[PDB]
């Protein structure tokens, strides 16, 4: 019983830490991640 | 905007906590009053990092929504990620 109540406690905290941060520069991230493999292709 | 109806994450984005501990440490580094009891601390970044965990920092963050409006969150109202 207490494991389940403890489990729902972290599924919230772990999720709310995944949410994208307002202000991230995304185009810098998606431009570099598609072209960084390119050097090895 | 009103204190009601604020739409933004309550958490403090890692960009805000980077500029809060920077701006606070720059104040402490110039003769600025310290909110928290300091014990063996000559370094401002460690002091400002300590004020943050105690939620004593006197700064309100003004978040501009993309449509031109803004919201004012004090550093106590926000929830420290780490």
Automatic annotation (TrEMBL), chain B:
Keyword set includes Transcription: yes
Keyword Transcription assigned: yes
GO BP of this protein: transcription by RNA polymerase I; transcription by RNA polymerase II; tRNA transcription by RNA polymerase III
GO cellular component: fibrillar center; RNA polymerase I complex; RNA polymerase II, core complex; RNA polymerase III complex
Subcellular location per the Swiss-Prot or TrEMBL entry: Nucleus
MF-aspect GO terms: DNA binding; DNA-directed RNA polymerase activity
Keywords from the named record: DNA-directed RNA polymerase, Nucleus, Transcription
Known function: DNA-dependent RNA polymerase catalyzes the transcription of DNA into RNA using the four ribonucleoside triphosphates as substrates. Common component of RNA polymerases I, II, and III which synthesize ribosomal RNA precursors, mRNA precursors and many functional non-coding RNAs, and small RNAs, such as 5S rRNA and tRNAs, respectively. Pol II is the central component of the basal RNA polymerase II transcription machinery. Pols are composed of mobile elements that move relative to each other.
Record family assignment: Belongs to the archaeal Rpo6/eukaryotic RPB6 RNA polymerase subunit family.
Protein's recorded name: DNA-directed RNA polymerases I, II, and III subunit RPABC2
Lineage start: Eukaryota, Metazoa, Chordata, Craniata, Vertebrata
Gene this chain is encoded by: POLR2F
Coverage span on the entire protein: 46 to 127 of 127
């Amino acid at each position: 019983g207490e494991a389940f109540d403890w489990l729902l406690g972290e599924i919230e905290s772990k999720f709310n830490q995944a949410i994208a941060h307002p202000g991230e520069m995304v185009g810098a991230l998606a431009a570099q991640s598609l072209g960084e493999p390119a050097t090895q292709m | 905007q009103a204190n009601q109806k604020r739409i933004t994450t309550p958490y403090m984005t890692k960009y805000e906590r980077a500029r809060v501990l920077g701006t606070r440490a720059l104040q402490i580094a110039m003769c600025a009053p310290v909110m928290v009891e300091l014990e063996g601390e000559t370094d401002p970044l460690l002091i400002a990092m300590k004020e943050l965990k105690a939620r004593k920092i006197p700064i309100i963050i003004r978040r501009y929504l993309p449509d031109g409006s803004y919201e004012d969150w004090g550093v106590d109202e926000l929830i420290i990620t780490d």
